[PDB]
Amino acid sequence: PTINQLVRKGREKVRKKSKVPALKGAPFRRGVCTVVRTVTPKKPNSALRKVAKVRLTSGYEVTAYIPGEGHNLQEHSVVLIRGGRVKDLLGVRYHIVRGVYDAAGVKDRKKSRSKYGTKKPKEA
Amino acid sequence: MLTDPIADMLTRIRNATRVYKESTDVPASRFKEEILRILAREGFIKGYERVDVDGKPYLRVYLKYGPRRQGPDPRPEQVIHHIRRISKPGRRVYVGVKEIPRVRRGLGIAILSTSKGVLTDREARKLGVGGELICEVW
RNA sequence: UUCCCGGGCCUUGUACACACCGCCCGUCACGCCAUGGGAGCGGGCUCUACCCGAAGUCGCCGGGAGCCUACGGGCAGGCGCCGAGGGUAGGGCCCGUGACUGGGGCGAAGUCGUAACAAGGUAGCUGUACCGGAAGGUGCGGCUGGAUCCUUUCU
RNA sequence: GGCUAAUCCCCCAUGUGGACCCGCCCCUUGGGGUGUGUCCAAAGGGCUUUGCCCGCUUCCGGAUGGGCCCGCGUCCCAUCAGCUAGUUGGUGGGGUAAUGGCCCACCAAGGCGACGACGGGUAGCCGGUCUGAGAGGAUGGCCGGCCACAGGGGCACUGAGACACGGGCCCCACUCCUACGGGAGGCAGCAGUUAGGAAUCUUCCGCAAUGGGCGCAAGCCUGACGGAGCGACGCCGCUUGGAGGAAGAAGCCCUUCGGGGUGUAAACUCCUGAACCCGGGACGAAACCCCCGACGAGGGGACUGACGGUACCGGGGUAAUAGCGCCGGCCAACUCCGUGCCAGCAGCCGCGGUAAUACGGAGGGCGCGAGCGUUACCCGGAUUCACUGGGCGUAAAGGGCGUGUAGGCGGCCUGGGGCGUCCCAUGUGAAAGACCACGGCUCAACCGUGGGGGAGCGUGGGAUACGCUCAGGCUAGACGGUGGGAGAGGGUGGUGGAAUUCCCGGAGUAGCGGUGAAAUGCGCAGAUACCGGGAGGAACGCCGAUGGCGAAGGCAGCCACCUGGUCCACCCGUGACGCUGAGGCGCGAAAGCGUGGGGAGCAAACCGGAUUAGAUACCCGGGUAGUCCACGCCCUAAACGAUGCGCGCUAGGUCUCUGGGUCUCCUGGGGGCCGAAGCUAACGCGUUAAGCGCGCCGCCUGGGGAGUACGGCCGCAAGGC
Ligand SMILES: [Mg+2]
Ligand SMILES: [Mg+2]
Ligand SMILES: [Mg+2]
Ligand SMILES: [Mg+2]
Ligand SMILES: [Mg+2]
Ligand SMILES: [Mg+2]
Ligand SMILES: [Mg+2]
Ligand SMILES: [Mg+2]
Ligand SMILES: [Mg+2]
Ligand SMILES: [Mg+2]
Ligand SMILES: [Mg+2]
Ligand SMILES: [Mg+2]
Ligand SMILES: [Mg+2]
Ligand SMILES: [Mg+2]
Ligand SMILES: [Mg+2]
Ligand SMILES: [Mg+2]
Ligand SMILES: [Mg+2]
Ligand SMILES: [Mg+2]
Ligand SMILES: [Mg+2]
Ligand SMILES: [Mg+2]
Ligand SMILES: [Mg+2]
Ligand SMILES: [Mg+2]
Ligand SMILES: [Mg+2]
Ligand SMILES: [Mg+2]
Ligand SMILES: [Mg+2]
Ligand SMILES: [Mg+2]
Ligand SMILES: [Mg+2]
Ligand SMILES: [Mg+2]
Ligand SMILES: [Mg+2]
Ligand SMILES: [Mg+2]
Ligand SMILES: [Mg+2]
Ligand SMILES: [Mg+2]
Ligand SMILES: [Mg+2]
Ligand SMILES: [Mg+2]
Ligand SMILES: [Mg+2]
Ligand SMILES: [Mg+2]
Ligand SMILES: [Mg+2]
Ligand SMILES: [Mg+2]
Ligand SMILES: [Mg+2]
Ligand SMILES: [Mg+2]
Ligand SMILES: [Mg+2]
Ligand SMILES: [Mg+2]
Ligand SMILES: [Mg+2]
Ligand SMILES: [Mg+2]
Ligand SMILES: [Mg+2]
Ligand SMILES: [Mg+2]
Ligand SMILES: [Mg+2]
Ligand SMILES: [Mg+2]
Ligand SMILES: [Mg+2]
Ligand SMILES: [Mg+2]
Ligand SMILES: [Mg+2]
Ligand SMILES: [Mg+2]
Ligand SMILES: [Mg+2]
Ligand SMILES: [Mg+2]
Ligand SMILES: [Mg+2]
Ligand SMILES: [Mg+2]
Ligand SMILES: [Mg+2]
Ligand SMILES: [Mg+2]
Ligand SMILES: [Mg+2]
Ligand SMILES: [Mg+2]
Ligand SMILES: [Mg+2]
Ligand SMILES: [Mg+2]
Ligand SMILES: [Mg+2]
Ligand SMILES: [Mg+2]
Ligand SMILES: [Mg+2]
Ligand SMILES: [Mg+2]
Ligand SMILES: [Mg+2]
Ligand SMILES: [Mg+2]
Ligand SMILES: [Mg+2]
Ligand SMILES: [Mg+2]
Ligand SMILES: [Mg+2]
Ligand SMILES: [Mg+2]
Ligand SMILES: [Mg+2]
Ligand SMILES: [Mg+2]
Ligand SMILES: [Mg+2]
Ligand SMILES: [Mg+2]
Ligand SMILES: [Mg+2]
Ligand SMILES: [Mg+2]
Ligand SMILES: [Mg+2]
Ligand SMILES: [Mg+2]
Ligand SMILES: [Mg+2]
Ligand SMILES: [Mg+2]
Ligand SMILES: [Mg+2]
Ligand SMILES: [Mg+2]
Ligand SMILES: [Mg+2]
Ligand SMILES: [Mg+2]
Ligand SMILES: [Mg+2]
Ligand SMILES: [Mg+2]
Ligand SMILES: [Mg+2]
Ligand SMILES: [Mg+2]
Ligand SMILES: [Mg+2]
Ligand SMILES: [Mg+2]
Ligand SMILES: [Mg+2]
Ligand SMILES: [Mg+2]
Ligand SMILES: [Mg+2]
Ligand SMILES: [Mg+2]
Ligand SMILES: [Mg+2]
Ligand SMILES: [Mg+2]
Ligand SMILES: [Mg+2]
Ligand SMILES: [Mg+2]
Ligand SMILES: [Mg+2]
Ligand SMILES: [Mg+2]
Ligand SMILES: [Mg+2]
Ligand SMILES: [Mg+2]
Ligand SMILES: [Mg+2]
Ligand SMILES: [Mg+2]
Ligand SMILES: [Mg+2]
Ligand SMILES: [Mg+2]
Ligand SMILES: [Mg+2]
Ligand SMILES: [Mg+2]
Ligand SMILES: [Mg+2]
Ligand SMILES: [Mg+2]
Ligand SMILES: [Mg+2]
Ligand SMILES: [Mg+2]
Ligand SMILES: [Mg+2]
Ligand SMILES: [Mg+2]
Ligand SMILES: [Mg+2]
Ligand SMILES: [Mg+2]
Ligand SMILES: [Mg+2]
Ligand SMILES: [Mg+2]
Ligand SMILES: [Mg+2]
Ligand SMILES: [Mg+2]
Ligand SMILES: [Mg+2]
Ligand SMILES: [Mg+2]
Ligand SMILES: [Mg+2]
Ligand SMILES: [Mg+2]
Ligand SMILES: [Mg+2]
Ligand SMILES: [Mg+2]
Ligand SMILES: [Mg+2]
Ligand SMILES: [Mg+2]
Ligand SMILES: [Mg+2]
Ligand SMILES: [Mg+2]
Ligand SMILES: [Mg+2]
Ligand SMILES: [Mg+2]
Ligand SMILES: [Mg+2]
Ligand SMILES: [Mg+2]
Ligand SMILES: [Mg+2]
Ligand SMILES: [Mg+2]
Ligand SMILES: [Mg+2]
Ligand SMILES: [Mg+2]
Ligand SMILES: [Mg+2]
Ligand SMILES: [Mg+2]
Ligand SMILES: [Mg+2]
Ligand SMILES: [Mg+2]
Ligand SMILES: [Mg+2]
Ligand SMILES: [Mg+2]
Ligand SMILES: [Mg+2]
Ligand SMILES: [Mg+2]
Ligand SMILES: [Mg+2]
Ligand SMILES: [Mg+2]
Ligand SMILES: [Mg+2]
Ligand SMILES: [Mg+2]
Ligand SMILES: [Mg+2]
Ligand SMILES: [Mg+2]
Ligand SMILES: [Mg+2]
Ligand SMILES: [Mg+2]
Ligand SMILES: [Mg+2]
Ligand SMILES: [Mg+2]
Ligand SMILES: [Mg+2]
Ligand SMILES: [Mg+2]
Ligand SMILES: [Mg+2]
Ligand SMILES: [Mg+2]
Ligand SMILES: [Mg+2]
Ligand SMILES: [Mg+2]
Ligand SMILES: [Mg+2]
Ligand SMILES: [Mg+2]
Ligand SMILES: [Mg+2]
Ligand SMILES: [Mg+2]
Ligand SMILES: [Mg+2]
Ligand SMILES: [Mg+2]
Ligand SMILES: [Mg+2]
Ligand SMILES: [Mg+2]
Ligand SMILES: [Mg+2]
Ligand SMILES: [Mg+2]
Ligand SMILES: [Mg+2]
Ligand SMILES: [Mg+2]
Ligand SMILES: [Mg+2]
Ligand SMILES: [Mg+2]
Ligand SMILES: [Mg+2]
Ligand SMILES: [Mg+2]
Ligand SMILES: [Mg+2]
Ligand SMILES: [Mg+2]
């Protein structure tokens, strides 16, 4: 575009949409489970994927993933939601944080335990 | 009409050298002459001369190239590899003396027009003045 | 050597490369998500017109209608303007809930069509118009981004 | 209701001086001087009271702090385009420390807006901070500067100053008290409570230091402040040992059962000695005050420490926390086992259906290490909004075409100006931060001292190339003149022949028509085929082209009239009059709309016939709107060269339309095809550029959602932008 044109018009700064309305971008948000359901992923993958519908302190109802080998969640469980999506499930935008509130850490987890929220064993 | 006589001349030169002409004719203006004079002092051209063509003044610019070359493509290295306008009508460019560009690590030149006259960057720095940045050449 | 079957070579078009037993578009079904329209109802803002109007400053009275007086005046008090805010009537926008309703997008991939890609088996695309529930079909005109010199199913 | 003092209030005086009206002078907005008239002062207290101290009054100046005013700079939406009656200005008032429509009366009718007014959204601004090669982007916590606010809204009072956080009045909401009349309150001060939240501290110590308020002082006050506490929240420093110690133990892992690994790792030997105990023990503090002097200067002297029995120093002295992420590629680190599209992993591509270096454990390894990871958000990489630094034939992207407004841009020569531009000086650019140097804490973080830098803006001086400007000149651009062309360029009117249909007539008879084959249809009321005549509407064969014209849409028999554009020659006239063009305005195929005409042929819809697994679809018969004309709308398109306009420059060859020429040919202007250089992802483009350049306009920014929704504008509607 001519210099004159840039002078008349100018470039448009490019705004960035948010991947996570955890509302006021907060690193985390507390909420309570509505449903704890399993759901089936998309084409080149098969599994029963563990998921929880949460009402949130934001006033938002969202869908969360429940990472780890097994979970204690159900019903009215209070929970912390951390954001980040499961790729191969449609519309799951956030993860549940193991080891906080009503979601316990993964039983018998030796490798990276700070994810999955489990504490250090004593060597026997 | 011709919107940028200086750009026009620079381009006539480029265009002419890329086909290895011995000379080209640019229409005549004092300012053009001052630019040529810088080029010809600097080694980019053999020189130039005032010339009449159909009763009108022109500047015949005598082009200059390198030795003939070996391998496929015998065509010579150009003496003017690069000749380019900076300040144009429609965006004019004025540098202060601290802002005079240094073209191609000194192997090239910039040509400023200053109230002390048309200078190369070196001339201008030594003369301690800035001006309109006309073109760069290397 | 036209035809059937298999094959070789050159060329051409291709949206095919799990390579035409291909691909895609569309439809009905099922599930999920977001959104359009929306009667009606809940609250919020703002504009105009009119009415009410605290405090206070200012202006006028301050009178045998009160208080002080050195008779000059001062205070109380009174009235008015302005005025926060409230009420009435209407105009306009914003949020929330929302009967009824539109398409959309994902997703197991099942159903049904066979529109497009090969001249895709009626060349295609196209603006507009009519018909069709839709895919699409036809008219008129246009484009080449068209191969070449009985109507022939799904995989 | 009553008494009463004062540095409380008032009256007269004195008037240095000052305030006001009028005049005069200098000065120039209301600054300074001067004259006459008027008006205006004061407070007393302490002492060793014979003179000092503390104060009081008027004035002039200083210093500091502020008010007001102007230039410039300061986010998103134009789906916000018009806003405005104190509105814009004037005279005169009012108000104030002071200018002002700040407020009021009267008068005029203005003011602002595409250089974005008005509206809506968001937001305290800055020094700086983060990021970035830079330009730029993002941010504004703490520290410093400014603004604003003190539950919400209004208002003033008292003052030098407030329209006042811990002051006052009123309205509103809320909490509490309430003898139901009425009252009290305001942590966005320090702590602390409670709620919301992913989340953010002690109801600590001290007045010792610096600072502040009052006091003659002594002194009092100070949740400013100096400190300590809590939290790996950040940064920096530090420890978990050091030297020896096997061809190398045990255990655990891998194994080709030969061995390999963890691993000098351990054990063990020796040395040092975080922690801890004992002892001493701070700087930060010398003024205020005392002494001599003179309550000065000068000299000299003594009191005071929250932090703290802390830091630090001396002596003694124990081998004494390690975790976290990762090891498919990007990306540094691989093997075994379990699992079998499960369980799971996942930032992206992907991994998992029996050998999984991708899941889970283990061994081993890589990276960091009192941390290591995760999520969120900012810059980066992203030259992915491209000023630096991108694009539009086919990837997203040239507006359907023009005319031109605003604006952007502007040939050659000379002169004045010196606005842009450049140079010098100067002022400003606080401190902190950043940079450099030197220094203080054992180092560092942290801090101190000094130096440098710095865009921008003010003032003075200077330069004149370029841009601007004014003045004059030129003719190469542009326009004109004369003469000569070609042309389906446009509008109006007329007219000619071929063919279809229909009507009349003659002659003639058994079918015609139509298809792959058929059938519907038409024909004995005589069709088809043949001849003659008539009516009517639409379109113009050959010429005709690989042609021409137009800005595009688009334009085709012939004639005449009206009219646009354009090309060449002559080199005659003007003298830069130029290019481009947001908005506007006009044109704009086909279909479509309105009114009125026309209606031969064709024909959406429709009615029928064979096909044939159906049929509304491809074939056949019929057929209405429409197709045609007038006038008025519609404004789309593969409106395409999918290629905006103009100008200059960069080989040729070949075919062609149209001028000129001394006419193998040359020289203009169009249309084509191949190709130099060059360009392009390639295909291709290539003097008819997609090459080299300048000017201007339009447009693009992953694919769907979607040319959808909402809004607006236009339209009779369809529907368009
Ligand atoms: Mg899979
Ligand atoms: Mg030559
Ligand atoms: Mg010479
Ligand atoms: Mg060059
Ligand atoms: Mg530049
Ligand atoms: Mg400058
Ligand atoms: Mg360098
Ligand atoms: Mg065969
Ligand atoms: Mg053969
Ligand atoms: Mg082949
Ligand atoms: Mg091929
Ligand atoms: Mg094709
Ligand atoms: Mg494929
Ligand atoms: Mg709905
Ligand atoms: Mg709805
Ligand atoms: Mg009233
Ligand atoms: Mg009142
Ligand atoms: Mg007032
Ligand atoms: Mg009286
Ligand atoms: Mg009163
Ligand atoms: Mg009123
Ligand atoms: Mg009201
Ligand atoms: Mg399907
Ligand atoms: Mg079909
Ligand atoms: Mg079709
Ligand atoms: Mg088909
Ligand atoms: Mg077809
Ligand atoms: Mg086709
Ligand atoms: Mg059509
Ligand atoms: Mg319909
Ligand atoms: Mg059909
Ligand atoms: Mg049809
Ligand atoms: Mg057609
Ligand atoms: Mg095609
Ligand atoms: Mg053909
Ligand atoms: Mg057929
Ligand atoms: Mg067949
Ligand atoms: Mg009394
Ligand atoms: Mg008395
Ligand atoms: Mg006197
Ligand atoms: Mg007196
Ligand atoms: Mg007094
Ligand atoms: Mg007295
Ligand atoms: Mg006395
Ligand atoms: Mg001052
Ligand atoms: Mg008004
Ligand atoms: Mg008025
Ligand atoms: Mg006035
Ligand atoms: Mg006003
Ligand atoms: Mg302006
Ligand atoms: Mg605004
Ligand atoms: Mg705000
Ligand atoms: Mg901001
Ligand atoms: Mg940095
Ligand atoms: Mg950097
Ligand atoms: Mg950038
Ligand atoms: Mg920066
Ligand atoms: Mg900012
Ligand atoms: Mg804070
Ligand atoms: Mg601050
Ligand atoms: Mg307020
Ligand atoms: Mg509060
Ligand atoms: Mg309130
Ligand atoms: Mg208030
Ligand atoms: Mg005072
Ligand atoms: Mg106060
Ligand atoms: Mg107050
Ligand atoms: Mg205030
Ligand atoms: Mg308070
Ligand atoms: Mg106070
Ligand atoms: Mg009170
Ligand atoms: Mg109150
Ligand atoms: Mg507090
Ligand atoms: Mg809570
Ligand atoms: Mg604290
Ligand atoms: Mg205390
Ligand atoms: Mg003190
Ligand atoms: Mg003090
Ligand atoms: Mg106190
Ligand atoms: Mg403190
Ligand atoms: Mg050792
Ligand atoms: Mg061993
Ligand atoms: Mg181990
Ligand atoms: Mg071994
Ligand atoms: Mg020892
Ligand atoms: Mg001390
Ligand atoms: Mg001391
Ligand atoms: Mg003291
Ligand atoms: Mg003495
Ligand atoms: Mg002394
Ligand atoms: Mg010691
Ligand atoms: Mg020792
Ligand atoms: Mg040990
Ligand atoms: Mg790989
Ligand atoms: Mg790395
Ligand atoms: Mg690797
Ligand atoms: Mg399993
Ligand atoms: Mg993992
Ligand atoms: Mg992430
Ligand atoms: Mg197995
Ligand atoms: Mg295995
Ligand atoms: Mg595998
Ligand atoms: Mg593995
Ligand atoms: Mg991985
Ligand atoms: Mg593993
Ligand atoms: Mg550290
Ligand atoms: Mg980024
Ligand atoms: Mg960069
Ligand atoms: Mg982008
Ligand atoms: Mg650019
Ligand atoms: Mg690009
Ligand atoms: Mg395409
Ligand atoms: Mg395109
Ligand atoms: Mg075009
Ligand atoms: Mg348009
Ligand atoms: Mg134009
Ligand atoms: Mg103009
Ligand atoms: Mg100009
Ligand atoms: Mg010029
Ligand atoms: Mg000049
Ligand atoms: Mg100047
Ligand atoms: Mg500084
Ligand atoms: Mg040091
Ligand atoms: Mg700066
Ligand atoms: Mg300066
Ligand atoms: Mg100056
Ligand atoms: Mg001069
Ligand atoms: Mg002139
Ligand atoms: Mg002419
Ligand atoms: Mg003529
Ligand atoms: Mg002739
Ligand atoms: Mg014609
Ligand atoms: Mg004509
Ligand atoms: Mg005609
Ligand atoms: Mg006829
Ligand atoms: Mg007859
Ligand atoms: Mg018939
Ligand atoms: Mg019959
Ligand atoms: Mg019959
Ligand atoms: Mg008969
Ligand atoms: Mg007969
Ligand atoms: Mg007949
Ligand atoms: Mg006849
Ligand atoms: Mg008729
Ligand atoms: Mg023909
Ligand atoms: Mg043609
Ligand atoms: Mg043309
Ligand atoms: Mg055409
Ligand atoms: Mg003519
Ligand atoms: Mg002449
Ligand atoms: Mg002349
Ligand atoms: Mg226009
Ligand atoms: Mg049209
Ligand atoms: Mg039409
Ligand atoms: Mg009609
Ligand atoms: Mg009609
Ligand atoms: Mg027909
Ligand atoms: Mg049959
Ligand atoms: Mg049938
Ligand atoms: Mg069939
Ligand atoms: Mg038909
Ligand atoms: Mg075309
Ligand atoms: Mg287009
Ligand atoms: Mg272009
Ligand atoms: Mg000729
Ligand atoms: Mg030609
Ligand atoms: Mg070519
Ligand atoms: Mg080439
Ligand atoms: Mg290029
Ligand atoms: Mg190539
Ligand atoms: Mg090629
Ligand atoms: Mg050319
Ligand atoms: Mg040619
Ligand atoms: Mg060109
Ligand atoms: Mg290109
Ligand atoms: Mg998108
Ligand atoms: Mg449309
Ligand atoms: Mg909207
Ligand atoms: Mg609409
Ligand atoms: Mg309308
Ligand atoms: Mg339409
Ligand atoms: Mg409508």
Which CATH number is B105's domain given?
3.30.1490.10
CA atoms within 13 A on the CB side of A7: 5
Instruction: Give the closest ligand to the alpha carbon of residue B90.
Output: 118
Domain carrying residue A45: 1-124
- Asked whether residue B16 falls in the same domain as residue B75, the answer is yes
- Asked whether residue B95 falls in the same domain as residue B63, the answer is no
Question: What residues contact residue A40 under an 8 Å CB cut-off, 6+ apart?
Answer: A46, A47, A48, A49
Q: Which of B83, B100, B101, B86 is nearest to B137 (CA)?
A: B83
Residues 1-60 of chain A whose Cβ lies under 8 A from any Cβ of chain B? 2-4
In angstroms, what separates the C-alpha of A3 from chain B's closest C-alpha? 7
In angstroms, what separates the C-alpha of A27 from chain B's closest C-alpha? 47
Q: How far apart are CA A54 and CA A93, in angstroms?
A: 12
- Asked whether residue B75 falls in the same domain as residue B85, the answer is no
- Asked whether residue B85 falls in the same domain as residue B67, the answer is no
Question: Which chain A residues contact residue B87 at CB under 8 A?
Answer: none
- Asked whether residue B75 falls in the same domain as residue B86, the answer is no
Confirm or deny that A31 is annotated as ligand binding. no
Size of interface A-B (CB pairs under 8 A): 4
Q: How far apart are CA A85 and CA A31, in angstroms?
A: 17
Q: How far apart are CA B50 and CA B33, in angstroms?
A: 9
Position of tokens 């010579």?
B76
- Asked whether residue B88 falls in the same domain as residue B138, the answer is yes
In angstroms, what separates the C-alpha of B98 from chain A's closest C-alpha? 25
**Could you give the dihedral angle defined by the CA atoms of residues A82, A87, A89 and A93, in that order, rounded to the nearest 10 degrees?**
30
Q: How far apart are CA B127 and CA B9, in angstroms?
A: 27
3-state DSSP assignment of residue A50: strand
**From the C1' of D474, which residue's alpha carbon is nearest?**
B56
Q: How far apart are CA B132 and CA B136, in angstroms?
A: 12
User: Could you tell me the CATH number of the domain that includes residue A68?
Assistant: 2.40.50.140
Q: How far apart are CA B21 and CA B46, in angstroms?
A: 12
Which one-letter DSSP state was computed for residue A7?
Answer: H
Domain carrying residue B95: 81-138
Confirm or deny that A117 is annotated as ligand binding. no
DSSP string, chain B: --S-HHHHHHHHHHHHHHTT-SEEEEE--HHHHHHHHHHHHHTSSSEEEEEEETTEEEEEEE--B-----SS--PPPBS-S-EEE-SBTTB--EE-GGG---GGGGTSEEEEEETTEEEEHHHHHHTT--EEEEEEE-
CA atoms within 13 A on the CB side of B77: 5
Rounded distance in angstroms from the CA atom of residue B31 to the C1' atom of nucleotide D459: 35
Q: Encoding tokens for residue A91?
A: 């519309």
Q: How many domains does chain B have?
A: 2
Q: Which of A35, A38, A34, A25 is nearest to A82 (CA)?
A: A25
3-state DSSP assignment of residue A101: coil
- Asked whether residue B18 falls in the same domain as residue B74, the answer is yes
Q: Which of B136, B131, B100 is nearest to B118 (CA)?
A: B131
- Asked whether residue B90 falls in the same domain as residue B43, the answer is no
Question: Which chain B residues contact residue A3 at CB under 8 A?
Answer: 90-91
Question: Which chain B residues contact residue A4 at CB under 8 A?
Answer: 90
- Type of residue found at B29: S
CA distances for B36 relative to A20, A67, A77, angstroms? 63, 75, 84
Q: Examine the fold and report which residue of B80, B98, B122 is the final residue of a domain before the chain moves on.
A: B80
CB-based burial, A5-16: b 16+ in 10 Å, e otherwise:
eeeeeeeeeeee
- Asked whether residue B122 falls in the same domain as residue B75, the answer is no
**B137 CA to centre of ligand 26 in angstroms:** 63
**B39 CA to centre of ligand 28 in angstroms:** 61
- Asked whether residue B72 falls in the same domain as residue B13, the answer is yes
Q: How far apart are CA A94 and CA A64, in angstroms?
A: 5
Q: How many domains does chain A have?
A: 1
- Resolution rounded to one decimal, in angstroms: 3.1
Q: Examine the fold and report which residue of B80, B110, B128 is the final residue of a domain before the chain moves on.
A: B80
- Asked whether residue B90 falls in the same domain as residue B25, the answer is no
- Type of residue found at B67: P
Question: What residues contact residue A107 under an 8 Å CB cut-off, 6+ apart?
Answer: A69, A70, A118
Confirm or deny that A44 is annotated as ligand binding. yes
- Asked whether residue B10 falls in the same domain as residue B76, the answer is yes
